[PDB]
Amino acid sequence: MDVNPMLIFLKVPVQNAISTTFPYTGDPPYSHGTGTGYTMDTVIRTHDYSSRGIWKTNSETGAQQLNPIDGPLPEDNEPSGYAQTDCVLELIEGLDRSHPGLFETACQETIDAIQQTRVDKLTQGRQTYDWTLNRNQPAATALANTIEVFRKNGYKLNESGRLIDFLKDVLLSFENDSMEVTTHFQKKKRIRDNHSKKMITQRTIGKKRVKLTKKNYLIRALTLNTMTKDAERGKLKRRAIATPGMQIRGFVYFVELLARNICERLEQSGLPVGGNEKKAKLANVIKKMMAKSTDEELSYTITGDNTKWNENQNPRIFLAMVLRITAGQPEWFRDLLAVAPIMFSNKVARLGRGYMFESKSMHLRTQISAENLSDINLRYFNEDTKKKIEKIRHLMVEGTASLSPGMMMGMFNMLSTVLGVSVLNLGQREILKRTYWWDGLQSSDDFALIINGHFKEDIQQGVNHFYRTCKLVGINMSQKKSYINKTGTFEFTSFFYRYGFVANFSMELPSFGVAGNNESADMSIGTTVIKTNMINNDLGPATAQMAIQLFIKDYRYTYRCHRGDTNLETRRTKSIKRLWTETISKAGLLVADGGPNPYNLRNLHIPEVCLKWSLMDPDYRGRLCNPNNPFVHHMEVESTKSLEYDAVATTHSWTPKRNRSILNTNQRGILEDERIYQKCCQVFEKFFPSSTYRRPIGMASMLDAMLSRARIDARIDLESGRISSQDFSEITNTCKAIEALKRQG
Amino acid sequence: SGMERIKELMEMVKNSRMREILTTTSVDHMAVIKKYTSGRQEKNPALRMKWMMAMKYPISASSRIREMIPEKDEDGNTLWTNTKDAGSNRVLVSPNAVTWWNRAGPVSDVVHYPRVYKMYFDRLERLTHGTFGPVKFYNQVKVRKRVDINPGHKDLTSREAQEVIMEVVFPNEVGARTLSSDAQLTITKEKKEELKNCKISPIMVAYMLERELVRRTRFLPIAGATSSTYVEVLHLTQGTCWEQQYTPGGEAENDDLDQTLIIASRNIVRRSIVAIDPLASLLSMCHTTSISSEPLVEILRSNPTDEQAVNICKAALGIRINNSFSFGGYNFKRVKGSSQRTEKAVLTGNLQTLTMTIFEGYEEFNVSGKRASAVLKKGAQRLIQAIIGGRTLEDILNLMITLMVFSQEEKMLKAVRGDLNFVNRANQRLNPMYQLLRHFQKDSSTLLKNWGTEEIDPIMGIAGIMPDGTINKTQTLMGVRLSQGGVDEYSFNERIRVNIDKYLRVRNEKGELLISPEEVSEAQGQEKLPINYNSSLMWEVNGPESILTNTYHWIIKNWELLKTQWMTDPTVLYNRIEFEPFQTLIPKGNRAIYSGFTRTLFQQMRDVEGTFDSIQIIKLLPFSAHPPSLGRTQFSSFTLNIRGAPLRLLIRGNSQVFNYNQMENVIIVLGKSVGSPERSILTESSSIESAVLRGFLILGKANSKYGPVLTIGELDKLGRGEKANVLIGQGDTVLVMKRK
Amino acid sequence: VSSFKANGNIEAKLGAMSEKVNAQIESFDPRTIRELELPEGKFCTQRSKFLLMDAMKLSVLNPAHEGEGIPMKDAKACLDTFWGWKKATIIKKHEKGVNTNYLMIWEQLLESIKEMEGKFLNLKKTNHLKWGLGEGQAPEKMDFEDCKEVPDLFQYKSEPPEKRKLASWIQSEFNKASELTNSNWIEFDELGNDVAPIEHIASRRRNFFTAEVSQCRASEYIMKAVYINTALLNSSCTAMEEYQVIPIITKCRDTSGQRRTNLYGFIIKGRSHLRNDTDVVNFISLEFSLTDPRNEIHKWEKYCVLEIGDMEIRTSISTIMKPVYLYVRTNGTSKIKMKWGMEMRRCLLQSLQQVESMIEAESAVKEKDMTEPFFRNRENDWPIGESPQGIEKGTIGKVCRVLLAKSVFNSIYASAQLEGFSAESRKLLLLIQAFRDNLDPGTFDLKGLYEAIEECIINDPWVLLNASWFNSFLKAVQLSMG
RNA sequence: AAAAGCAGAGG
RNA sequence: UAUACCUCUGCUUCUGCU
RNA sequence: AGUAGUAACAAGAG
Ligand SMILES: O=c1ccn([C@@H]2O[C@H](COP(=O)(O)NP(=O)(O)OP(=O)(O)O)[C@@H](O)[C@H]2O)c(=O)[nH]1
Ligand SMILES: [Mg+2]
Ligand SMILES: [Mg+2]
Numbered sequence A: 001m002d003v004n005p006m007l008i009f010l011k012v013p014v015q016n017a018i019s020t021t022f023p024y025t026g027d028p029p030y031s032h033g034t035g036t037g038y039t040m041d042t043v044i045r046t047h048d049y050s051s052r053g054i055w056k057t058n059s060e061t062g063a064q065q066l067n068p069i070d071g072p073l074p075e076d077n078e079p080s081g082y083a084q085t086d087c088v089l090e091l092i093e094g095l096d097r098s099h100p101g102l103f104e105t106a107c108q109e110t111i112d113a114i115q116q117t118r119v120d121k122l123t124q125g126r127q128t129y130d131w132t133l134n135r136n137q138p139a140a141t142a143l144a145n146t147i148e149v150f151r152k153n154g155y156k157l158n159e160s161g162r163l164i165d166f167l168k169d170v171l172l173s174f175e176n177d178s179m180e181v182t183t184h185f186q187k188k189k190r191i192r193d194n195h196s197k198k199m200i201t202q203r204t205i206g207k208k209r210v211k212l213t214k215k216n217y218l219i220r221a222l223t224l225n226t227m228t229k230d231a232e233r234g235k236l237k238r239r240a241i242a243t244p245g246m247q248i249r250g251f252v253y254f255v256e257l258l259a260r261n262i263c264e265r266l267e268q269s270g271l272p273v274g275g276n277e278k279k280a281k282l283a284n285v286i287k288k289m290m291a292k293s294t295d296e297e298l299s300y301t302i303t304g305d306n307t308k309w310n311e312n313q314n315p316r317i318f319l320a321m322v323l324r325i326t327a328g329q330p331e332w333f334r335d336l337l338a339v340a341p342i343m344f345s346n347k348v349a350r351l352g353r354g355y356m357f358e359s360k361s362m363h364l365r366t367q368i369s370a371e372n373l374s375d376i377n378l379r380y381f382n383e384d385t386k387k388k389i390e391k392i393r394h395l396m397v398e399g400t401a402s403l404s405p406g407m408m409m410g411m412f413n414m415l416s417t418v419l420g421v422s423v424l425n426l427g428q429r430e431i432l433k434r435t436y437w438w439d440g441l442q443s444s445d446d447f448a449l450i451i452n453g454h455f456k457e458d459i460q461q462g463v464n465h466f467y468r469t470c471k472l473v474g475i476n477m478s479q480k481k482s483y484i485n486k487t488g489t490f491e492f493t494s495f496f497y498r499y500g501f502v503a504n505f506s507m508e509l510p511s512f513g514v515a516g517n518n519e520s521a522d523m524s525i526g527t528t529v530i531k532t533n534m535i536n537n538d539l540g541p542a543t544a545q546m547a548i549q550l551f552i553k554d555y556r557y558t559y560r561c562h563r564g565d566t567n568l569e570t571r572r573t574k575s576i577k578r579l580w581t582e583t584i585s586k587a588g589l590l591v592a593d594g595g596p597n598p599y600n601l602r603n604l605h606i607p608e609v610c611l612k613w614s615l616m617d618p619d620y621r622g623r624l625c626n627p628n629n630p631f632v633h634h635m636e637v638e639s640t641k642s643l644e645y646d647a648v649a650t651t652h653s654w655t656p657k658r659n660r661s662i663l664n665t666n667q668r669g670i671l672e673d674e675r676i677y678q679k680c681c682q683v684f685e686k687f688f689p690s691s692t693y694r695r696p697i698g699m700a701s702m703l704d705a706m707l708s709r710a711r712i713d714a715r716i717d718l719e720s721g722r723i724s725s726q727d728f729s730e731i732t733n734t735c736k737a738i739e740a741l742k743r744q745g
Numbered sequence B: 001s002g003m004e005r006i007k008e009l010m011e012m013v014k015n016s017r018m019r020e021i022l023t024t025t026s027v028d029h030m031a032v033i034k035k036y037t038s039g040r041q042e043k044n045p046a047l048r049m050k051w052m053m054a055m056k057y058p059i060s061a062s063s064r065i066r067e068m069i070p071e072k073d074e075d076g077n078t079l080w081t082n083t084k085d086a087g088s089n090r091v092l093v094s095p096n097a098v099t100w101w102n103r104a105g106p107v108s109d110v111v112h113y114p115r116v117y118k119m120y121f122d123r124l125e126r127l128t129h130g131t132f133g134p135v136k137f138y139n140q141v142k143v144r145k146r147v148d149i150n151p152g153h154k155d156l157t158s159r160e161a162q163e164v165i166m167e168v169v170f171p172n173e174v175g176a177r178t179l180s181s182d183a184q185l186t187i188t189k190e191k192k193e194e195l196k197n198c199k200i201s202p203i204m205v206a207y208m209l210e211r212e213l214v215r216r217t218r219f220l221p222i223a224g225a226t227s228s229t230y231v232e233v234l235h236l237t238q239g240t241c242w243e244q245q246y247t248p249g250g251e252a253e254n255d256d257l258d259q260t261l262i263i264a265s266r267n268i269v270r271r272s273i274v275a276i277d278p279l280a281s282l283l284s285m286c287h288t289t290s291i292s293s294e295p296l297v298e299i300l301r302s303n304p305t306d307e308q309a310v311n312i313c314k315a316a317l318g319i320r321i322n323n324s325f326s327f328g329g330y331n332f333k334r335v336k337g338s339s340q341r342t343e344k345a346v347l348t349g350n351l352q353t354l355t356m357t358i359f360e361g362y363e364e365f366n367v368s369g370k371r372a373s374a375v376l377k378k379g380a381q382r383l384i385q386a387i388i389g390g391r392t393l394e395d396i397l398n399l400m401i402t403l404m405v406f407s408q409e410e411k412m413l414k415a416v417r418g419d420l421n422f423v424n425r426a427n428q429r430l431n432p433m434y435q436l437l438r439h440f441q442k443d444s445s446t447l448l449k450n451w452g453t454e455e456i457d458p459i460m461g462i463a464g465i466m467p468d469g470t471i472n473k474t475q476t477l478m479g480v481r482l483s484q485g486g487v488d489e490y491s492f493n494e495r496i497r498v499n500i501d502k503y504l505r506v507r508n509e510k511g512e513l514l515i516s517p518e519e520v521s522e523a524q525g526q527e528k529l530p531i532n533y534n535s536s537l538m539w540e541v542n543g544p545e546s547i548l549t550n551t552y553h554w555i556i557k558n559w560e561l562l563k564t565q566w567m568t569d570p571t572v573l574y575n576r577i578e579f580e581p582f583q584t585l586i587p588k589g590n591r592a593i594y595s596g597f598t599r600t601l602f603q604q605m606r607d608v609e610g611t612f613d614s615i616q617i618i619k620l621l622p623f624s625a626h627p628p629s630l631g632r633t634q635f636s637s638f639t640l641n642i643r644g645a646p647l648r649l650l651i652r653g654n655s656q657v658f659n660y661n662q663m664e665n666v667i668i669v670l671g672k673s674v675g676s677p678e679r680s681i682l683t684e685s686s687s688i689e690s691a692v693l694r695g696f697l698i699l700g701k702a703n704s705k706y707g708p709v710l711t712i713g714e715l716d717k718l719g720r721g722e723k724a725n726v727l728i729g730q731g732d733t734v735l736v737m738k739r740k
Numbered sequence C: 001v002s003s004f005k006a007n008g009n010i011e012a013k014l015g016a017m018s019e020k021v022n023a024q025i026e027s028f029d030p031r032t033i034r035e036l037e038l039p040e041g042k043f044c045t046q047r048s049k050f051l052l053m054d055a056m057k058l059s060v061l062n063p064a065h066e067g068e069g070i071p072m073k074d075a076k077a078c079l080d081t082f083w084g085w086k087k088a089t090i091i092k093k094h095e096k097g098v099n100t101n102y103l104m105i106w107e108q109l110l111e112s113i114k115e116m117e118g119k120f121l122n123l124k125k126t127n128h129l130k131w132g133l134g135e136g137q138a139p140e141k142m143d144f145e146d147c148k149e150v151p152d153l154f155q156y157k158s159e160p161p162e163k164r165k166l167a168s169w170i171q172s173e174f175n176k177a178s179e180l181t182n183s184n185w186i187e188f189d190e191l192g193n194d195v196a197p198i199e200h201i202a203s204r205r206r207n208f209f210t211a212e213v214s215q216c217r218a219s220e221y222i223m224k225a226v227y228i229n230t231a232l233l234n235s236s237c238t239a240m241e242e243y244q245v246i247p248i249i250t251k252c253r254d255t256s257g258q259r260r261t262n263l264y265g266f267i268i269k270g271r272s273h274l275r276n277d278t279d280v281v282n283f284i285s286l287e288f289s290l291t292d293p294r295n296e297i298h299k300w301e302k303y304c305v306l307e308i309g310d311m312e313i314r315t316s317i318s319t320i321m322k323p324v325y326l327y328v329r330t331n332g333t334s335k336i337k338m339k340w341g342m343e344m345r346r347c348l349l350q351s352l353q354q355v356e357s358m359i360e361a362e363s364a365v366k367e368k369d370m371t372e373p374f375f376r377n378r379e380n381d382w383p384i385g386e387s388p389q390g391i392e393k394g395t396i397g398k399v400c401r402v403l404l405a406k407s408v409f410n411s412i413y414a415s416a417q418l419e420g421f422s423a424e425s426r427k428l429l430l431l432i433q434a435f436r437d438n439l440d441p442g443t444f445d446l447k448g449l450y451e452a453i454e455e456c457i458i459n460d461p462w463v464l465l466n467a468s469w470f471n472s473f474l475k476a477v478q479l480s481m482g
Numbered sequence D: 001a002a003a004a005g006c007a008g009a010g011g
Numbered sequence E: 001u002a003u004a005c006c007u008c009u010g011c012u013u014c015u016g017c018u
Numbered sequence F: 001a002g003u004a005g006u007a008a009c010a011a012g013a014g
């Protein structure tokens, strides 16, 4: 008998057994190599869908920019980027007219948040294109290098600690003709490896001074570094993602904050809510949309997705939307909120790392960069890369490629949600006054669209009307990945509604494992993951008990901390058995110390050091929760082998070893400033205790804050009986000598 | 004493690079240079922990451990090695050093774990002394609500608790921020009294106070109790198909117990009005009911909560009534006049559509609580007079603001400035009166400026307040007089003995009608503590959707006997008490005409032979449980009230409420399956439909031989033998025949 | 934009646009849609990291030697119970590979197993082992600036995978994987005391689940893959240069309660200096087997099979003597594949959740726990297979083992073809579901949907089997309306 | 009715 | 020259290694 | 060779 699991769907409905259709127990698809081909394919598709637009050369950058807005109306069912701006403005105007007072309150919220916001809000990003280094750096170091290059020129407004002064300096920086940066460079030499007896190359990374020209800095400030996306499920082919830099992220933050304030107060946006709040909002607006319909009306639902969404939007459409939303607002508000579509319309896309080129008479491989792909003769590339370089060659501006149309992968998620919500809003029956009307939800590009009509032909006309109205604004519904059915069952952002949102346990299956922090945090994470999946994702009681057993097995085999009655032989077996045999109450030992599992379905919310506190030996809990714990960090005793505070952490809260080494690469030239910065933060925190708890606020230099703090604390210690007058004179003389060293260096 | 850190700073200021960083980087830019990295970062720490435990030393620790842990074990294992390049304050540590510290380390008699993690020990004490009841299996109906995972201080909000935490732990590090409340000052004094000479680090003290005082809320799918001691064990008490009875270890909170008392009493009253004897059903339901495993009839004896549904339960028991309610922190002792509630649609001042319940009728009030007192005459959407008194200047204005919001005119509703949402971020219906109250209690200028002025006769016993605040005895507001003594207290704490009758209307010993069952709010909120109506009049879990699914489940699983009652002697079938909590979701006007429509459909299905559809009996049978009317109309749906929103149940076919899937052969009610009727459906399902229209038989699809199409209410111009087409619903076109 | 007044612009450009821009709803009916187009070509090859249905274990019962737990000691104790070692002779050649290298690799392996004095075994860097592990098959990576004068510097080629054909062995592997055994392969850990009533109910249901799921053959493949990936990860990260020998060893308990150590073969680790997460550590797998490769040779394209022994095999009527082969091949893995292979035990979480929901969805309707009626009243409720008679229905334990084996093979045969196929065929399953709900479904481009589904069915045996399964389910749905 | 980091998922 | 943006959920409060 | 799959690993920047 040939076994077929999908015949299970002959009895169980597909949404009830949907977790079988998610093969999420194997490895996800990774890429191997460069994302240069995916970047080239994104650029080629982006200029393919907008090819009938206006070609014009930018006077500042020189890039061949393509202008598809107000272009010819589409003639086929393909992707099209030709968006009509009067249609976009009519949609934003009708969105305002249906929701009165919304735009003014959102704009006033954003005006009040503009003056509050500091520069460090930009340090909450992951990996940023450092235009100073032409690489990816973390966003804090990218902002730090940007602010250092800015203040090394005559651009010091960001010293006032506000985001908007940094944005004033950003827009003023394009006027500088000869912006000067500090870059990295390697010094290679050949030395012999000793453990393998091979001659290899030793790269030492250093610093270097180089000056950018005006047009080169304008290219690097508009550059979106492109990489390939790893571990994406559900796709056969890979795709490219892009990261912008510090010149653009502040403006995109303010535009997305304004659009977030808009999207929070729209019934038809799935953003920014998420999880159970999203499911509650979706079921409530489904109930409201089915309350708006009558008995005679049909009701269908489009389980929709839009094809090639981010390359078929436009920054010019977003400029029109920003200027129509902020109508009646101040002019500095309109200019500051309109910077970001202008920075996205003149943008430029760095291709990748290049390609690997293979020789056979020399038996060699090498990496020729993406900025060197225009030097190689075309007979060396394979046919697809040859076609891509032929289709892309006229767009190259200093290794990057001109990319005037399209968003390039999701930097305007809420503004795109507003643009889709306007087309959802146009289908009101008092606006349309037709034989059909529609309403729906929209996250960014996904939409559920409930269309009502008196007959099925009116549903067809409503589908056509919605599809053409989306075509007029640059939104192309995927005819492959979308489908329609009667209302009561749909899918929206992998939430499978079947008269109510069913669960999907498999999607949260990669959370079920040992997290890998230390022995205590992993135990809390594993028990809490089982707990929250029992709460939210309909994990059964028996399966949760089996998940406790599987996590205890994985935890013991990971940390080599099996019990004392087991005979497995690890590095820790003799020490754990010595702790096991000498302990009277073995039920109070932690799982990381050979103890038994205390956990069942009722005590998942109680930590393990708490669940076993009554069963511990007094010597064992005096050793485990010892105040002078050497595995954790101790504070220093402030102004109340020096004095420390007592550590409340256990011995299983240790720090795992980190490795930052790069193969054959010495990095003592660029890892030094990080060490000096951490030394400066550590000497600051001895004067200000709360700086670890809540990040401090100020505009004066750290030396002046620390010297004023030392002076006033010496005076309060003098006039409260906690210091002598000789100590007070010593501290004030020291602060005066430091003040003599802050100027007379 | 503070002399070592200044010498550290003088040593770090002589290095010129460090001096440049200390002099050029401000305190706001030190947030940026704190997260500055340069080297390669490592993804996927799970796999790195999977392989790094194979190494001898996967743990890094401070260099002091060279003096607190020996280099070798008894068994010869090396416990640590120094790192290669010297100068670093780190060494590499084996996990055998951890096990050696746990078996032969120094033993300290003081441990800060039970104090810092007091919350988890309180959860453990709640679980250990917790009682477990049986496990029941039925269809859960969970609602994703915002609940407290941390209850916080009752006197503090999260912002005020963070103010208190920054005042207790870091008193020199608050900025230009002062404490506002007396609660914040008292909790700061108490927490400074406890945490003085504390050896715990200030950050750990801050997080201990943060898990004590700060309220945290999450959106969770809740069935039943939403208190913070029933949400902590939410994985244990509820599942997808089962309910685990549980009572924690301790006392129930009073501010939770009063609320679930109100909700329990509202459900008992609203179920009681539908019954044959509302008084006997209320007395049968009130004794078996237990809130948090404590009986209801002995909580009502001692609870001082005064509310129009709690009072009917108390007047049926024999407990003295304080005939009042609460609104905005003030008790409203209504003296004269009886109003009645009606749902209306009100356009607001922010052009916002809003649907409320306004009370039509004349009333007179005696408002008073905790700082002030006022006597109020008020009709339908009108604030006549308000002789407001009190004990300060601000408190009489606060009571004036509260009474102007309570008036519910057309003037305060068109006086809103700014935004005021009446749905939440998850589009859940916020209460409109408290929304307007919290609006007009912070920004109150445009209400007073639109309130205007009125000329009053300058006689004593009445003063006046201007629309700014300067007291004049000639010009006042439009109703706002200042009482020079207020109203007399010591008669608002006085409780009243009361009579009650069969239909739950409360009278005093004089005879003035205090409470009616119509005054009881038909708001469906869910409780903080679990309520167990141990009755044959209420299902297991209450709420509207649970009533729907439990009623349809009971009809489906008893269909073999209910079908036999339907076929012969049906007048005993409709009056069954299991259909009686279903009627609480139909609004009161439609119940008689829905039952008349349903009984006419069932009689036509009996008389027209062969037209049997059991799904059409199951779907409409809980609507026939009301003494009908005779009004010959034509319904295309039956509207029910669920969570403050209507839901339409179509007479023909499937809907969002009641679907019948031929795939699973299962009837789905509100996303939950309630079973197959008897798997006896193949003998049914003919062509002609009988229980859709009142007097007409559906004969297949439409026809062009029989004239143009119609709508539902265009059939009175038809005769016995005239056949026509009807656009019945859901895009269908059917042929329609009249009977003789 | 500040002074824009809408003058009916959208209706104007709706009239001005062409009527070749539309979304025509075409009605969906599964009695009219075609089946998925499986590719054509050569048959599909086994690509797993170990033999599944054909592997043979030398087993010892209740080990009590000097190294009861140490890997190579248990390997030596299991090899000592086989005395049929004859000379190695190749009986099935690897076509693209030097087969005498595989012969000399097994000879060097067995001889160093003989002279093994220690707990570990590192093989010697010989020429045939350096071929079988690929030491030297990389071109030396240079910097472009130092090799600007190379004439033959062409590129790396980016051919797609070649379209293979559905061979019948992968259905046989899934058949043998969903069957019970005479052992217990998962040996769980302890819980706390079941104090709450729901913990008694959960423990009763978990005992049923453990009885049905610990003796399945997919649990044996779970333990083999978890052990192999664990030992390979530890050896790859701690023995980077050395050619470490890793024996495939699992530990089971029989249903009579006695322990057993099974040896399935050996894995010679290669050089492993992995820096990425997709960098491939090469190894050589040598697994004992009894199945002749010359009967289903298309399955064994990458294998060199050399007959290495004899064993007296007992049978149901009498007792015979069979030869013993050794499937040798070069294989490779990465840190991501070893990471996701060490975590194969969550396949138990993927199946046992679903079956539990199948009980719970009944338990809410029956107003009772339906665990014991599902596991004892064997009424054959769920359809899980296709026989020549009709469609075969199994019980909830059979469904539990089938869903276990499906998750296990999703983890063994993980590929981007599987991800794309499942994501694109989920939509077709939802359209068929919407049809069976009488919810009147309809697409706009069904040809593009079929083209996107069939784009992923290329060469993977599991994905080809899943497409065949989809076609069988579609034919069952079409027969259900007859 | 009333701070940041890491991990996982989704888009 | 290499893991983007946004959102939700969960945990933790980190001192910095050829 | 093998892993693999639109470009790589098969040690010498992750
Ligand atoms: O990882 C992600 C996924 C999605 N997105 C954003 O979400 C949008 C829709 O995500 P998508 O998955 O639909 N991809 P799309 O670009 O529409 O092409 P297609 O597969 O043909 O539908 C994308 O266009 C991005 O803007 C991201 O930014 N990052
Ligand atoms: Mg898309
Ligand atoms: Mg979608």
Ligand SMILES: [Mg+2]
Pocket: A305, A306, A445, A446
């Ligand atoms: Mg999408």
